Ligand SMILES: *[C@@H]1O[C@H](CO)[C@@H](O[C@@H]2O[C@H](CO)[C@@H](O)[C@H](O)[C@H]2NC(C)=O)[C@H](O[C@@H]2O[C@@H](C)[C@@H](O)[C@@H](O)[C@@H]2O)[C@H]1NC(C)=O
Ligand SMILES: *[C@@H]1O[C@H](CO)[C@@H](O[C@@H]2O[C@H](CO)[C@@H](O)[C@H](O)[C@H]2NC(C)=O)[C@H](O[C@@H]2O[C@@H](C)[C@@H](O)[C@@H](O)[C@@H]2O)[C@H]1NC(C)=O
Ligand SMILES: *[C@@H]1O[C@H](CO)[C@@H](O)[C@H](O[C@@H]2O[C@@H](C)[C@@H](O)[C@@H](O)[C@@H]2O)[C@H]1NC(C)=O
């Protein structure tokens with residue numbers, strides 16, 4: 274029961290996507306998760322983008338869980354080096370029809386006053402009390418406190434290619450981050466049992482957030498643009 | 511406990527390498543695993559390169575197994591498209607002081623008359639009776655019949671960047687293959703328990719092989735050059 278799709282660019286007001294909060298599609302077709310005005314990224318911003326149709330990751334009847342592969346390119350430009358950019362972006366899987374969560378270090382996927390389960394791969398740029406040095410790739414399950422973490426050096430404003438893959442048979446979720454201009458490769462993997470954390474049908478998308486006002490630092494910001502995206506899932510049941 | 515090494519290029523008569531059979535270091539500093547004469551790759555060739563000192567992947571005392579990361583660049587040039595190039599190169603871990611094994615589809619690591627255990631990541635270019643379509647990346651444990659396999663399109667004579675990583679905690683062995691000139695990314699991962707297949711101390715290196723004479727095809731050949739190599743392992747024990 275293979276479901277797939279592929280965006281090589283985002284057309285003005287896509288009918289296939291659900292934009293939430295600050296998330297919007299620029300004129301030259303890039304998906305801007307967080308707010309940016311007159312070419313400058315703003316603080317206190319939060320946006321999500323979900324694929325309109327829900328996907329089935331597992332079937333209670335057969336018991337089978339799906340295997341999927343997703344690839345996307347993103348770009349994070351950090352105009353203000355000091356004191357520290359924030360907060361990063363995540364690719365995530367959550368239950369259908371959920372609301373944007375807390376911003377800042379929560380990327381907009383975690384909501385303390387009404388937590389919903391989720392699996393996410395984060396590209397963290399700000400170091401919270403629970404974070405290892407940044408920037409880092411992290412694998413998150415129901416929490417923003419990563420199970421596994423790996424550090425990476427960002428290519429400011431450059432392009433990044435990400436490949437996230439999940440094998441239902443081995444339950445291995447491996448992610449690859451490549452910065453073509455620098456020729457650097459970062460890899461990370463962990464075991465995650467989707468069947469054990471998520472409902473049969475879920476939503477897949479991105480979420481990002483800039484510096485929280487409580488930090489009292491307007492320079493705590495950056496862009497979180499998604500250039501293209503393809504997803505593919507195969508449920509044998 | 512940490513051991514590591516890096517090779518930005520290879521020197522003629524490198525003291526920390528162990529060249530075996532056809533393996534030799536070219537003047538312009540590349541490591542040629544298989545024979546190549548007058549700029550042309552020969553058939554019936556087999557060569558290996560091992561890191562001189564042995565590495566400890568696990569400690570029987572504490573029971574701890576090591577985590578390691580290795581990165582290398584290689585290049586495979588296929589001068590003769592038809593009838594078929596052969597056979598490929600592999601990165602491998604084996605017991606200390608082993609002799610080159612059978613050539614051809616065995617890459618020089620498997621010896622039917624005296625099989626020794628080994629873990630290897632293969633870059634297979636010839637399709638044997640036990641192979642899926644080629645070329646393909648495969649994860650091998652004690653056998654040349656891969657546990658997991660993924661197909662990839664080679665960049666003839668181009669450069670390839672490989673990243674192999676192993677987490678002792680999850681027992682996940684993930685490999686990434688990137689062809690910078692084409693911008694393609696191939697990923698594969700599987701669970702391997704080193705402690706269960708290998709001795710406490712091992713040797714790490716490369717091995718490659720060109721077409722076997724029994725195939726009666728001199729065009730069954732290609733180059734197997736390693737351009738650079740870095741290795742790092744950690745044993746909390
Ligand atoms: C917020 O980012 C601004 C641009 O990155 C910083 O301003 C720049 O600061 C440089 C030295 O830090 C200075 O040479 C530049 O001329 C100046 N450029 C701009 C766009 O004003 C700013 O730095 C601090 O605050 C500003 C207002 C100045 O007073 C600087 O001297 C300060 O270092 C950054 N502010 C923060 C939150 O640190
Ligand atoms: C082994 O590789 C050789 C070099 O690529 C092949 O020769 C080339 O074959 C082409 C077609 O296969 C032909 O257009 C080229 O002119 C030729 N190049 C030269 C001068 O060597 C060789 O091909 C065999 O020999 C040629 C003359 C034809 O009879 C082909 O049909 C033959 O396959 C390759 N031999 C094998 C075993 O495939
Ligand atoms: C962060 O964004 C929210 C939503 O756009 C704004 O309401 C915040 O503005 C501040 O709070 C509101 C209620 C209002 O009092 C306004 O004047 C405040 O500036 C904004 N936070 C900040 C501090 O910019």
Ligand SMILES: *[C@@H]1O[C@H](CO)[C@@H](O)[C@H](O[C@@H]2O[C@@H](C)[C@@H](O)[C@@H](O)[C@@H]2O)[C@H]1NC(C)=O
Nearest residue numbers: 531532545553554555556613722723724726
């Ligand atoms: C393949 O290479 C090995 C070692 O490099 C040779 O020993 C093989 O055999 C030798 O060459 C053949 C032609 C024959 O003369 C034999 O007596 C030699 O031992 C070689 N095989 C081939 C076909 O080249």
Ligand SMILES: OC[C@H]1O[C@H](OC[C@H]2O[C@@H](O)[C@H](O)[C@@H](O)[C@@H]2O)[C@H](O)[C@@H](O)[C@H]1O
Nearest residue numbers: 359360377378483484485488489490493
């Ligand atoms: O300013 C950006 C930052 O603000 C929030 O947290 C501020 C943070 O400041 C640090 O210096 C302190 O150590 C820490 O305790 C405070 O929480 C926000 O949580 C963070 O994600 C980011 O927006």
Ligand SMILES: OC[C@H]1O[C@H](OC[C@H]2O[C@@H](O)[C@H](O)[C@@H](O)[C@@H]2O)[C@H](O)[C@@H](O)[C@H]1O
Nearest residue numbers: 596597614615636720721722725727730
């Ligand atoms: O030609 C190079 C090739 O030689 C051996 O395999 C030959 C192969 O020929 C096929 O036609 C048959 O179907 C198969 O049974 C034979 O094995 C060698 O084993 C292989 O790795 C490669 O070098």
Ligand SMILES: [Ca+2]
Nearest residue numbers: 378397399401
């Ligand atoms: Ca953070």
Ligand SMILES: [Ca+2]
Nearest residue numbers: 615634636638
């Ligand atoms: Ca083969």
Ligand SMILES: [Mn+2]
Nearest residue numbers: 397404411419
């Ligand atoms: Mn984090």
Ligand SMILES: [Mn+2]
Nearest residue numbers: 634641648656
């Ligand atoms: Mn194979």
